[PDB]
Design a protein around this nucleic acid. Structure first.
Ligand SMILES: Nc1ncnc2c1ncn2[C@@H]1O[C@H](COP(=O)(O)OP(=O)(O)OP(=O)(O)O)[C@@H](O)[C@H]1O
Ligand SMILES: Nc1ncnc2c1ncn2[C@@H]1O[C@H](COP(=O)(O)OP(=O)(O)OP(=O)(O)O)[C@@H](O)[C@H]1O
Ligand SMILES: Nc1ncnc2c1ncn2[C@@H]1O[C@H](COP(=O)(O)OP(=O)(O)OP(=O)(O)O)[C@@H](O)[C@H]1O
Ligand SMILES: [Mg+2]
Ligand SMILES: [Mg+2]
Ligand SMILES: [Mg+2]
Lengths: 401, 398, 104, 441, 193
DNA sequence: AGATTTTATGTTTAGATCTTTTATGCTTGCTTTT
């Protein structure tokens, strides 16, 4: 019966196994050097010690070591744009603290962790934190009551517990009860909780948290700045090891054109993998700079001029006449009727006949499904509004040069 | 595909081209079907009856599973999926259950069989114009149900509108458009004259009149009568069922001089121009209380006389809005008797509103606060009739 | 990042030159492409420009009022330009962009 | 008769090829090679990738994915070391429906014969715990998210954030593969979800913008293939059916044409497509929409007309189906109206031409009609109620649309250009001369 | 007299597409006519000729609620002649119930609409199109209660909706005539003190 | 060792909320005929 399976799942007594491969994975020594760089360059392979994040490592390490040794509890808020080494640094600090507590240089501590985007509801965090404690799956009300019984009541020998919370802005909602509980539990003396909260926006406690929640979040804070031109080069040359499969100018061009956009490290580690895959099909064993230029042009794509050049001729006449009506009437939003009149003018100039308006609505629907233009549902023909989504100069660049 | 068109053509005169196109696209079940067909036309063009007779003949003659729908019935998508799978998965009983669009696609994927038996499926959706008003994932899935279910099915759609009305923001898959043209006068005469044996039998079961009718009710007589009928009635309507239901009554009036002993056209053209004024009305004086009559003509003057003219008429575009106190002021000005403001008078105001003699153009939520705006919704001739029965001459105040 | 610098300079230019502060993402991107063309450096496409403006939004420099379509989103500056000039720390570039009225 | 049956075999063959050829892919060499090497590296080396097919609707994206899966699946390595999870944005309208479908298709322990137990939160927790519990020793999942832009519309984009994050993590080697028609799907993503996406993108613009490629495509779609190609195609389809579309695919071994029949058919097809009339029909068809679904729709309407009395395709048949395609379908509705509704539309056209497209009303149009009807000498007899029912008959065809009040006073808009009414004036049958004179002035 | 004519109309439809339908030009005094429609249901049940639903305007704000109260009224009326939840009384369940019961014998499915003037127009037109879609499979009869005049019926029914209507007009006697009859035969009777 | 309410839980749909945007209306300030 299924109910015994669900009871063994909710009690945690069966581990959720995944199916194993029929065939064994290939041995490491059969790999090419370019494949070795392709697998060292994967974003999932976190280094044991992160380059160019030593200052933030010392900051989070000093905070967590002081909160653990003082047995007091508290809270911290780290923030920054995605791909800047936030969660990797926090888990590296926590792994270093666990390695130190294993050798009895530090007091032992529990390490709970959650993430706000793995929860369907903000209150489901109560289900998950308790699942990192006892392992039972229970309802969020009973889990919140048991967590309050654990944290509000002094029960020696209570051990220190560090609750990392990624994705803090998803847990907010309007009532903000969950984030208030998670930041209010450390303030009680009986709970030794040290909650760290990772988020993207710098101004989150003032922008969307309540005043008491911002007051509980405190003034200790850390900001992960975007990677510069040089740190992105140090990251990729640390990932490659001593291998010369990448040219140094190729990594310099990847870092120079990724740091100018975002400062994300995942973009550099993905563009270098695509450059390795491009160099693999050319049967070269060094990733020369034009392979990096091809991978950069592929992964920072701008394929709308190709879409306008690949459109059918009546759709190109339609794309000319929408920009013509925008230039004529001045306002950016045009009705289909004046667009069709400019269509008849341009088609009378070019000499081809144009399809009747019931087929011009099919052309407008195709351009609006391709998102070359923004357009309404077709049920209100001749009065539907047609925004131009592509820029007006891109159409002339496509249909002239 | 030949037997179906041969079996539908006697039932449907002047539709040999549409029946030929339907029997080429979805006639044989061994041949693969187009992914969707959309035939369209006016009212009375005969598309519901044509797809019903076609689906019935294909289901009786061949292996196909047919499913006819009316999309007005499907206020939620679950109703449509449950009826569609009740027809395409027969004898499932009350154990049938469909949660959403995905369960419908999976249970239709289970219905696939071997290619030797050459099974097919057919889905007709009458009133398909309502499909664009619902969940906005029903129509795109219905236009590619064959690709999704991996199954030899065509989804016919039926509407009074062209398919140019049906495109959405996300686009649509390809469809085979088909047009049912409405008939001209000659084909309409052939269609009205195709039921001649039925009306001849109906007269022969209804005794000198029996022999004098059966010796003179031959095919040229009914054709000349239908020519005299369509010479006057085709200007107002091309709708074939309306022409049938009026032409039978007009023949019942027309036939009398023949039974009683050209030379017919004037005697019918009297009544024939009277039946022309009763077209679309399918038929086979509002008494009121006295103070309700005065309230109704006061509301007509309030909606017809504008706000500025009351000061000159009573101190002694469209219909205008009026507040209830303006109605009571005009009612007391035209009453010249001065009854008290009892409960029954304002109750007459509310029950004139409930009969759609007045209307609530705004307000509604606050009738009592004085922010309500009413609008009289009757014609002038009813007001003049009420003023005749009452004795209040309305035209003095207009 | 340099593209975020160009976006902030074009937004400061459009806010200074125009009485109507209803700046859309498309109306800003069409000026940003002309500014990148006159600087002789490659411009981002609109799909990458939306993510660039979203990354500038996390610093609190901007606020994006969402609309039905990504082109129709309304950028709203939330710093004064005297703070934006000290934050960009590239006065030789901002002096070139803000003196570039003809590219609007 | 043998000649009556060879045409039936040719017609069933051509129809089955135009409708059910789910894996054959013309064109896209480098793009198919990119998708194939990416899925092959995910299945063999355990790399966690992600990909995003892009292009106009009607280009072969689903056909490209089916071609790559059909050539990878019978390898007895990709088929044993990789489980495939299709998802569709039109059927999986919510995250929990897609999550129950993921739990079923991966055959997780809590699935049990297609009825997943537990809540949406328990399903997400069990799926993420099964994925975290795996590694390089575990089987590779290949997610295939058709209509990816509808998956972007879900709450928090939460399922997308999970599906990318496993690809960013040292867990089970999954390969997310979106397929969508929008060219700017990537700006719909949240910045966290956009960061975890690997920005490689494959655009599938059709390779037949040139007219000669369109004529070669229309020739290859109608020609009968050589019989050894039927043997190799039936061999590949049998290989993909020994191990989803394979229950109802092409199966071209059912049909085996004689060499004289294939030679006469390909001769007639080349002779028809060499003519100027068939090339002009294909030129107008290519001028409207170049996508292959449009040409396959036109060719299905063409192949469906092969009666035994007329075995051959001819240029006049293609011209007839092309004349069927290009005609306006609102003029064909205007010609079906009776003379009273046509007089109402002429009064509406006069009110629109005079007042410069101002919104009208039933009362204004009935007054403008009665001013003609008093001297029309054929329209004197109509009641106001018949003209009102004719106005409602105009309204239900959406030739008149409300501005979005009594039904006789509601404001309205004409849904027609004046040229459509002017062409209705010439295409109308048995139009009285009084209406034809009133329409001019 | 009008009761015998309406019962003869329903039985004549039972002896036998457009739905047959009978406008009943009743007076302004709407509450009084519930006894008339109740006597019609009593006669139709006593003859075993039909089963009757009664659609009040308060029960039918939307097409969904109208279909639910219609099917629930027909099934519970048949149950009361000789309880499913209102969420599941689909028209498909009405067809399955009619096939399980009366296909072996035809009872009419009379649908009284006593307050025709009070209805939403779009809900009423969609309901008439729904009942017209099921003709042949389900024998429907649609008697109405028009307090005003037949011009209201011709106004609220558009060209498409009146294409599927075969209505017949019955006339209830005038309210002042009923007042005069009551005042002469009751309040002026010798037998009351 | 199996059937029945009983209860606790999750989903879904109708209603409260936030926010923009648009409009008639409430009042003002002249404006102008009798
Ligand atoms: N300084 C660095 N040195 C080496 N690798 C890095 C560095 N920073 C980032 N990476 C790589 O990029 C990935 C970034 O993941 P991480 O979890 O740090 O991102 P994040 O900032 O938490 O993103 P988000 O804010 O969207 O959650 C890591 O897997 C790591 O492999
Ligand atoms: N060509 C024809 N020959 C004979 N009868 C016809 C023909 N066309 C229509 N009819 C008759 O029209 C009647 C009903 O037409 P039908 O209801 O199919 O029109 P419709 O298009 O469904 O109308 P609507 O679009 O308003 O629902 C049928 O009883 C049928 O007998
Ligand atoms: N390159 C191609 N090779 C073979 N057939 C093609 C190709 N492109 C399009 N087609 C044909 O076009 C029709 C539709 O193609 P397909 O189903 O691949 O489009 P799609 O990718 O599903 O589009 P969308 O996903 O936007 O609906 C199919 O019948 C297919 O035979
Ligand atoms: Mg993180
Ligand atoms: Mg119909
Ligand atoms: Mg597809």
């Amino acid at each position: 019966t299924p109910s015994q399976k669900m009871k063994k799942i909710r009690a945690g007594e069966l581990s959720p196994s995944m199916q194993q491969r029929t065939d064994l994975p290939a041995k490491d020594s059969s790999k090419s050097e370019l494949q070795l760089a392709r697998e060292q360059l994967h974003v999932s392979v976190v280094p044991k010690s992160l380059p160019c994040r030593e200052r933030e490592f010392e900051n989070i390490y000093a905070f967590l070591e002081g909160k653990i040794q003082d047995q007091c509890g508290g809270c911290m808020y780290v923030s920054g744009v995605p791909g800047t080494g936030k969660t990797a640094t926090v888990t590296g600090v926590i792994r270093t603290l666990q390695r130190m507590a294993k050798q009895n240089e530090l007091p032992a501590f529990e390490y709970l962790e959650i993430n706000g985007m793995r929860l369907t509801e903000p209150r489901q965090a109560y289900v998950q934190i308790y699942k990192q404690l006892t392992g039972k799956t229970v309802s969020w009300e009973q889990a919140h009551a048991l967590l309050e019984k654990r944290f509000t009541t002094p029960a020696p020998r209570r051990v220190t517990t560090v609750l990392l919370v990624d994705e803090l802005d998803i847990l907010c909602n309007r009532r903000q009860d969950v984030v208030y509980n998670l930041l209010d539990w450390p303030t009680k003396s009986a709970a030794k909780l040290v909650v760290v909260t990772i988020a993207n926006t710098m101004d989150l406690p003032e922008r969307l948290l309540m005043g008491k929640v911002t007051s509980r979040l405190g003034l200790t804070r850390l900001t992960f700045q975007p990677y510069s031109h040089k740190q992105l080069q140090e990251i990729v040359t640390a990932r490659l090891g001593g291998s010369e499969t990448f040219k140094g100018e190729a990594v310099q061009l990847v870092a120079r054109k990724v740091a100018a956009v975002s400062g994300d490290a995942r973009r550099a580690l993905d563009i270098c993998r695509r450059a390795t895959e491009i160099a693999d099909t050319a049967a070269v064993k060094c990733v020369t700079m034009l392979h990096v230029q091809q991978a950069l042009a592929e992964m920072i794509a701008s394929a709308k001029v190709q879409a306008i050049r690949n459109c059918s001729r009546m759709e190109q006449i339609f794309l000319q006449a929408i920009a013509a009506e925008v230039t004529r009437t001045g306002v950016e939003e045009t009705t289909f009727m004046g667009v069709y009149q400019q269509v008849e003018t341009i088609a009378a100039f070019m000499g081809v006949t144009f399809p009747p308006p019931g087929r011009a609505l099919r052309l407008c629907s195709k351009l609006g499904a391709e998102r070359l233009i923004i357009s309404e549902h077709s049920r209100n023909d001749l009065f539907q509004k047609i925004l131009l989504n592509v820029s007006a100069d891109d159409i002339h660049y496509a249909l002239r040069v | 595909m030949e037997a179906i068109c041969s079996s539908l053509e006697p039932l449907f005169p002047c539709r040999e081209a549409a029946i030929e196109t339907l029997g080429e696209l979805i006639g044989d079940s061994s041949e693969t079907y187009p992914s969707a067909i959309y035939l369209f036309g006016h009212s009375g063009t005969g598309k519901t009856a044509l797809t019903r007779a076609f689906l019935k003949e294909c289901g009786k003659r061949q292996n196909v599973r047919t499913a006819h729908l009316n999309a007005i019935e499907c206020y939620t998508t679950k109703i449509m999926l449950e009826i569609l799978l009740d027809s395409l998965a027969p004898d499932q009983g009350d154990a049938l259950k469909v949660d959403n669009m995905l369960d419908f696609v999976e249970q239709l994927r289970r219905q696939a069989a071997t290619r030797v038996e050459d099974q097919g499926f057919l889905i007709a959706v009458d009133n398909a114009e309502r499909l664009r008003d619902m969940d906005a994932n029903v129509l795109p899935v219905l236009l590619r149900l064959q690709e999704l279910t991996n199954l030899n099915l065509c989804v016919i759609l039926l509407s009074q509108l062209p398919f140019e009305k049906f495109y959405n923001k996300t686009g649509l898959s390809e469809i085979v458009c088909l047009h049912l043209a409405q008939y001209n006068k000659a084909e309409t005469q052939r269609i009205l004259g195709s039921d001649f044996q039925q009306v001849r039998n109906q007269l022969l079961e209804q005794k000198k009149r029996l022999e004098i009718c059966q010796e003179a009710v031959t095919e040229d007589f009914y054709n000349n009568y239908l020519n005299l009928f369509l010479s006057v009635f085709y200007k107002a309507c091309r709708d074939v069922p309306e022409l049938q239901l009026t032409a039978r009554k007009c023949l019942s009036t027309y036939l009398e001089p023949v039974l009683d002993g050209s030379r017919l056209w004037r005697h019918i053209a009297g009544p024939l121009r009277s039946a022309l004024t009763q077209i679309y009305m399918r038929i086979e004086s509002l008494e009121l209380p006295y103070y309700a009559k005065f309230l109704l003509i006061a509301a007509f003057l309030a909606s017809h006389n504008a706000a500025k003219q009351d000061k000159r008429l009573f101190v002694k575009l469209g219909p205008k809005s009026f507040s209830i106190d303006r109605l009571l002021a005009i009612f007391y000005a035209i009453l010249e008797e001065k009854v008290g403001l009892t409960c029954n008078l304002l109750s007459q105001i509310s029950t004139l509103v409930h009969l759609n003699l007045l209307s609530f153009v705004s307000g509604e939520q606050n009738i009592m606060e004085g922010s309500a705006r009413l609008q009289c919704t009757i014609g002038l001739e009813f007001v003049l009739q009420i003023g005749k029965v009452v004795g209040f001459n309305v035209r003095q105040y207009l | 990042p340099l593209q975020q610098k160009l976006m902030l300079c074009t937004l400061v230019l459009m806010l200074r030159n125009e009485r109507n502060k209803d700046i859309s993402m498309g109306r800003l991107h069409e000026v940003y492409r002309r500014v990148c063309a006159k600087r002789n450096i490659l411009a981002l496409d609109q799909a990458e420009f939306t993510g660039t403006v979203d990354l500038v939004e996390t610093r609190g420099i901007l606020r994006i009022m969402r609309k039905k379509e990504p082109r129709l989103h309304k950028v709203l500056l939330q710093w004064d330009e005297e703070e934006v000039h000290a934050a960009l720390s590239d006065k030789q570039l901002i002096a070139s962009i803000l003196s570039d009225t003809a590219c609007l | 008769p043998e000649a009556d049956r060879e045409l039936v075999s040719i017609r069933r063959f051509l129809k089955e090829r135009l409708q059910r050829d789910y894996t054959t892919l013309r064109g896209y060499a480098k793009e198919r090679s990119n998708v194939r090497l990416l899925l092959q590296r995910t299945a063999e080396m355990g790399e966690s990738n992600s990909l995003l097919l892009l292009g106009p609707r009607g280009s072969g994206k689903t056909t490209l994915i089916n071609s790559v899966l059909a050539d990878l699946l019978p390898n007895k390595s990709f088929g044993e070391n990789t489980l495939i999870v299709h998802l569709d944005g039109n059927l999986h309208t919510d995250d929990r429906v897609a999550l129950k479908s993921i739990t079923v298709q991966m055959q997780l322990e809590n699935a049990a014969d297609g009825k997943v137990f537990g809540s949406f939160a328990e399903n997400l927790a069990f799926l993420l715990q099964c994925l975290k519990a795996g590694g390089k020793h575990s089987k590779s999942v290949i997610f295939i998210l058709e209509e990816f832009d509808l998956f972007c519309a879900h709450h928090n984009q939460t399922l997308l954030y999970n599906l990318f994050d496993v690809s960013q993590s040292a867990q089970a080697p999954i390969c997310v593969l979106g397929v969508t028609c929008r060219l700017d799907v990537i700006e719909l993503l949240e910045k966290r979800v956009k960061s975890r996406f690997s920005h490689r993108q494959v655009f599938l613009f059709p390779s037949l913008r040139r007219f000669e490629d369109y004529v070669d495509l229309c020739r290859d779609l109608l020609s009968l293939p050589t019989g050894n190609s039927l043997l190799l195609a039936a061999e590949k389809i049998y290989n993909l059916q020994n191990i989803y579309f394979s229950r109802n695919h092409f199966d071209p071994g059912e049909y085996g044409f004689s060499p004289r029949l294939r030679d006469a058919w390909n001769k007639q097809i080349c002779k028809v497509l060499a003519t100027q009339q068939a090339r002009s029909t294909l030129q107008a068809l290519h001028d409207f929409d170049i996508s292959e679904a449009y040409l396959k729709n036109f060719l299905f309407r063409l192949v469906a007309h092969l009666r035994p009395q007329s075995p051959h395709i001819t240029a006049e048949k293609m011209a007839a189906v092309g004349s069927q395609f290009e005609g306006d379908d609102k003029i064909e509705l205007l010609c079906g109206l009776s003379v009273l509704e046509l007089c109402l539309i002429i009064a509406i056209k006069h009110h629109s031409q005079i007042y410069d497209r101002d919104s009208f009303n039933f009362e204004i149009i009935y007054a403008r009609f009665s001013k003609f009807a008093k001297v029309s000498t054929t329209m004197q007899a109509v009641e106001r109620s018949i003209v009102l029912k004719a106005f409602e008959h105009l309204r239900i065809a959406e030739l008149i649309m409300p501005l979005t009040v009594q039904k006789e006073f509601e404001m309205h808009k004409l849904a027609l250009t004046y040229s459509q009414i002017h062409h209705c004036m010439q295409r109308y049958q048995a139009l009285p001369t009084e209406v034809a004179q009133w329409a001019q002035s | 007299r009008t009761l015998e004519q309406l019962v003869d109309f329903v039985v004549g439809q039972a002896e036998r597409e457009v739905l047959p339908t009978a406008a009943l030009l009743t007076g302004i005094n709407q509450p009084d006519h519930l006894s008339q429609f109740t006597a019609l249901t009593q006669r139709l049940h006593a003859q075993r000729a039909a089963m009757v639903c009664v659609l009040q305007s308060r029960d039918c704000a939307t097409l969904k609620a109208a279909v639910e109260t219609l099917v629930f009224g027909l099934v519970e009326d048949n149950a009361e002649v000789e309880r499913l939840r209102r969420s599941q009384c689909t028209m498909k369940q009405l067809k399955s119930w009619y096939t399980n019961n009366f296909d072996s014998e035809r009872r009419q499915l009379v649908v009284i609409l006593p307050d025709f003037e009070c209805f939403n127009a779009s809900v009423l037109q969609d309901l008439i199109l729904i009942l017209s879609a099921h003709c042949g499979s389900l024998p429907f009869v649609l008697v109405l209660g028009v307090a005003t005049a037949m011009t209201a019926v011709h106004g609220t029914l558009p060209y498409h909706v009146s294409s599927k209507i075969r209505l017949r007009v019955f006339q209830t006697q005038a309210a002042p005539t009923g007042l005069n009859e009551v005042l002469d035969k009751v309040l002026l009777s010798p037998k009351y003190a």
